[PDB]
Design a protein around this motif. Structure first.
Motif, PDB file in Angstrom:
ATOM      1  N   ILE C 202     -49.148 -29.745 -20.107  1.00 43.56           N
ATOM      2  CA  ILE C 202     -48.363 -29.879 -21.013  1.00 43.56           C
ATOM      3  C   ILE C 202     -48.854 -30.351 -22.501  1.00 43.56           C
ATOM      4  CG2 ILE C 202     -46.713 -31.683 -21.841  1.00 43.56           C
ATOM      5  CD1 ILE C 202     -44.725 -31.114 -19.689  1.00 43.56           C
ATOM      6  N   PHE C 203     -50.097 -31.078 -22.265  1.00 45.66           N
ATOM      7  CA  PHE C 203     -50.699 -31.577 -23.417  1.00 45.66           C
ATOM      8  C   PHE C 203     -51.359 -30.227 -24.492  1.00 45.66           C
ATOM      9  CE2 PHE C 203     -51.718 -36.216 -23.941  1.00 45.66           C
ATOM     10  CZ  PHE C 203     -50.614 -36.846 -23.315  1.00 45.66           C
ATOM     11  N   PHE C 207     -49.644 -28.471 -27.909  1.00 44.55           N
ATOM     12  CA  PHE C 207     -50.895 -28.933 -28.631  1.00 44.55           C
ATOM     13  C   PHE C 207     -50.953 -27.521 -29.262  1.00 44.55           C
ATOM     14  CE2 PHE C 207     -55.508 -28.894 -29.426  1.00 44.55           C
ATOM     15  CZ  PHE C 207     -55.635 -29.783 -30.383  1.00 44.55           C
ATOM     16  N   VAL C 208     -51.066 -26.278 -28.868  1.00 43.83           N
ATOM     17  CA  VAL C 208     -51.313 -24.791 -29.251  1.00 43.83           C
ATOM     18  C   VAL C 208     -50.150 -24.284 -29.879  1.00 43.83           C
ATOM     19  CG1 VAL C 208     -52.367 -22.810 -28.811  1.00 43.83           C
ATOM     20  CG2 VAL C 208     -53.426 -24.744 -27.952  1.00 43.83           C
ATOM     21  N   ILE C 210     -48.007 -25.950 -31.715  1.00 40.16           N
ATOM     22  CA  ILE C 210     -48.273 -26.888 -32.745  1.00 40.16           C
ATOM     23  C   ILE C 210     -48.841 -26.091 -34.087  1.00 40.16           C
ATOM     24  CG2 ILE C 210     -48.592 -29.191 -33.774  1.00 40.16           C
ATOM     25  CD1 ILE C 210     -48.481 -30.170 -31.050  1.00 40.16           C
ATOM     26  N   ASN C 211     -50.041 -25.673 -33.462  1.00 36.43           N
ATOM     27  CA  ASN C 211     -50.968 -24.925 -34.467  1.00 36.43           C
ATOM     28  C   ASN C 211     -50.831 -23.496 -34.773  1.00 36.43           C
ATOM     29  OD1 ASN C 211     -51.866 -27.734 -33.405  1.00 36.43           O
ATOM     30  ND2 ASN C 211     -52.899 -26.451 -31.840  1.00 36.43           N
ATOM     31  N   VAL C 214     -48.095 -23.940 -38.045  1.00 38.37           N
ATOM     32  CA  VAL C 214     -48.817 -24.334 -39.282  1.00 38.37           C
ATOM     33  C   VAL C 214     -49.680 -23.261 -39.850  1.00 38.37           C
ATOM     34  CG1 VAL C 214     -50.902 -26.017 -40.067  1.00 38.37           C
ATOM     35  CG2 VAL C 214     -49.123 -26.780 -38.624  1.00 38.37           C
TER      36      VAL C 214
END
Lengths: 219, 219, 219, 219
Positions: C202-203, C207-208, C210-211, C214
Motif C-alpha cells: 500500500i505504501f 506513492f506511485v 501520487i506521482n 503531478v
C-alpha cells in the motif's frame, strides 16, 4: 543575567539539546503504552517525563526573557507554550482528556527542527485560497443535514436522529465510506426515494471537490 | 583472462539471452501453481529450476571479474545478488519463506531492461524529498497511537490494546476504509466522545497527506 | 454514381440524420429493458432496430466509396465499422456476449457529434505521458500477485488461490475497497504478518499514484 | 409611491434586518428538533414561524414594486420566491414533504450575503463546460445499464432487475464503494464471467471521470 541567558538561548547546543529531547521523548514515551515496558522499566519514565516537563517549562520561561513581545507573536511559540501547558495539569484531576493531549508536546519536532518548519509554512499557505470552496461547502452541509434530521431520522435513529449525527453521516457519504450499502439502500428499503435525496447530493459535493484541486493548480 | 570475458558479459547476445530466460522461467511459475501440472510436468520444471539457478550463478560470476568493486557498489547489481543468494538456500532448512521469495527473479525483468530501469530511478528519487513531513507523519501516529492505547485498548484490544495494534487501526482509519461503520461507530457505544479523538486525527492527516502532494506539484 | 453518393454523404442533412438516429435509438432502446415496455410496445422496437442496423450498414458502405483508404485510417471510423459489425450477428448464435455488446453501437454520439470528438481527442492524448508509471505499476503488480498466490492462497482459496484472483484482490486493495476489514485482518487472523505483506505494498502503490497526477500537471 | 419604497428596499438597514432574521430563525430549526423543546417552548416557536413567513412575504412584496420585471429575471430572486411559495402551502394538505422543504430558507444565507454569492457564480458556471463528456457519461450508463438488465436482472433483481435499478447499482460500482465484496463477488457465484461486464465499465469510467478533470485543469 539579562545578557547571559540570551547568549545561552541562541547557542547551537541549546537548540540541538531541545531537538535531542523530543526524539528521545518520542522514543521513550512511545514505550509508555506497552503492557510489559511499565511492568519492569516502570518508574523509569514516570520520573523521566517529570524532568522532561520541568526542562520544557524552564526553557519556555528562558525564551520569554529574551524576546517576550516576539514570543507571543510567533505561530511556533504560542504552540509550544499551550501545548506544554496542557501537560502541566497533574495525572488525575477533572478529566483524562488533559492527560491524553499531553504527548502532543512532541509536535515540536516541527517547531525546533528547521526543515519541516518551511514546508509546514508551505502547507497551511494553501487554505487562504480554499475558503471560497470551503465556506459554501459547509453552508451546503448545514442545509443538507437538517432535511435529513426531520424527514429520515424520525424512523432512522442512529443515522439521522440529531443534527450532529446527520453531519456525521453526510461526511461519511462524502468520504463515500460504505456510502450506499451502509446508508442509501437500507434507507431506500423504507423511503424508496432517498436516491433522489442522496444521488444529487453526491453529484454537487464531488463536483465541488473536483474544482478545489484545480484551483490550487492554476494559482 | 580479464580481456576475454569483457567480450561476453557486455555482448549484445548476453542481454537477450537473459531476457529469453526470465520470461520463460516467468511463465513456469504461474504454470507451476497448477496441481494438474505438478503431477505430470513436475520433474520437467524442477530440473528447469535447477537449470535456471545454475546459469544465473554462472552469469553473476561472469560479472564479478569485470566490474569487480563496481559491482558491490551498484544498486541494480546488489539486488540481483540477493535474488540468487536467497534462492541458493536449499529445498528445506529454516522456514519455507525463503523458498517463497524465489519469485523475485521476475523483478529481474526490471534490472535486465533499460526501459523499466528508466522509471525506478525517477520514482524512488522522490522518497528523500518527502521526508519533510513523513518524519512528521510517523510522529502524529506515534503520539496519538500512545493515547489510542489506554483510551480504547482495554475495552477494545483487537484494535487498540497494543501500541502497534493501535498503529494498525490508525493506519486504516487514515486510509479511511471503515473508520465509520467499522471502528468509530462501535467504539462509541462505550465511548460517546470517541469522535473527538478521531475526526481530527482523520482531519489532520487529510490535510497533511493532501498538503504533501501540493508541494510535490510545486517541486 | 461515383459522384452522386459523395454529394449526399458530405451534406448537412446526411450528417444530422445519423445524429438524429443515435439519440432516438438510445431513447427507444433504453426501453428495451423494461418488463412492461416489451409486453405492450413489443414488436415495435424488434423491427425498428432491424431498420436501424440496415441503415447503419448501408451508411458504412456509403462512406467507403467516398474515401476508402481514408476510412480504415480514422480512429472514429474503424470504431463505427466493427462496433456496428458486432451487431450484425443474429439474436441467438454462439453466445449472448455478441448480442450484449450490440447497444455499444450508440458510442457514435461521440463519433458523429463534433463537440465530444475534440475532448475525447484531448482525453486519450494523456496516456502516452502515463506509460512510464503504468508499465512499472503492472510489473509491480505481476510480482506482488504471485507471492500472494503461493503463500496465502493455499489456505485462502477465493482471495489468493489463482494468479488472476490475486490481481483481482490487489486491485481491490488498490482501490482500498473494504481493503482491511475484508482482507488483511481476516488474513492476519491466520498468518499474523500479512501487515508486512500489505502495508509496504500500500505504501509503494499509492506513492506511485501520487506521482502520476503531478506528472500530468507539470507537463 | 415608487420613489418612496426604493429608499427602503435598497437601504443599509434592510440587508442587516434580513441577516438578523435567517440566523435567528436558523437557530430555531435545530432547536425545533428537540421534543423537550416542543412541549414547553412549542407555542413560542410556532408563532415565530408565523411571524417569519409574514415578514418575508412583506419583504418579497416590497421587492416587486421596484425591480418589477428585473425580479422575475434574476436567478437569486426567482429562488427566494420558491422558498416562500412552498412555505405558504398550509400546515396540512397533500403531503408533508412541502412542510419539510421549509428548511431551504437557510439557503437564504447564500442569497442575502454577497461573499457567499461569490462562490455560487464561479462553481455553477463550470457545469455547462463539462457536458462535453457528461452527455457521454450518461450514455455509457444508458447503453450498459440495458445490458445489465437482462444479463443479471433475472437472477439478481434487487440490483439489476429494472433498468433504473441497474442505473443505481452501476452508479455505485462507478463510485467504487462495494463493487467487489458487494456486487461482483456474489454476481460471480452464478455468472463466472461477470468481471468481463464490470472491470471495463469500472475502467472506462475511471479513465473518463479522471480525464474530465485533466481538461478542467487545462481550461
Amino acid at each position: 543575567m539579562y545578557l547571559r541567558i540570551t547568549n545561552i538561548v541562541e547557542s547551537s547546543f541549546f537548540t540541538k539539546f531541545i531537538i535531542y529531547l523530543i526524539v528521545l521523548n518520542g522514543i521513550t514515551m512511545g514505550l509508555e503504552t506497552s503492557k510489559t515496558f511499565m511492568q519492569s522499566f516502570g518508574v523509569y519514565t514516570t520520573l523521566f517525563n517529570q524532568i522532561v516537563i520541568t526542562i520544557f517549562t524552564i526553557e519556555i520561561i528562558l525564551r520569554i526573557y529574551v524576546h517576550r513581545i516576539s514570543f507571543f507573536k510567533d505561530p511556533w511559540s504560542l504552540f509550544d507554550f499551550f501545548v506544554v501547558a496542557i501537560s502541566l495539569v497533574p495525572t488525575s484531576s477533572g478529566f483524562e482528556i488533559l492527560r491524553v493531549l499531553r504527548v502532543l508536546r512532541l509536535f515540536r519536532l516541527v517547531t525546533a527542527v528547521p526543515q519541516m518548519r518551511k514546508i509546514v509554512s508551505a502547507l497551511i499557505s494553501v487554505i487562504p485560497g480554499m475558503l471560497s470552496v470551503i465556506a459554501l461547502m459547509t453552508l451546503f452541509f448545514y442545509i443538507f443535514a437538517i432535511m435529513a434530521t426531520q424527514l429520515f431520522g424520525e424512523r432512522f435513529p442512529e443515522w439521522f436522529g440529531t443534527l450532529g449525527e446527520s453531519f456525521y453521516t453526510l461526511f461519511q457519504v462524502m468520504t463515500l465510506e460504505s456510502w450506499s450499502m451502509g446508508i442509501v439502500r437500507p434507507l431506500m428499503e423504507v423511503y424508496p426515494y432517498a436516491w433522489v435525496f442522496f444521488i444529487p447530493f453526491i453529484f454537487v459535493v464531488t463536483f465541488v471537490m473536483i474544482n478545489l484541486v484545480v484551483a490550487i493548480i492554476v494559482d
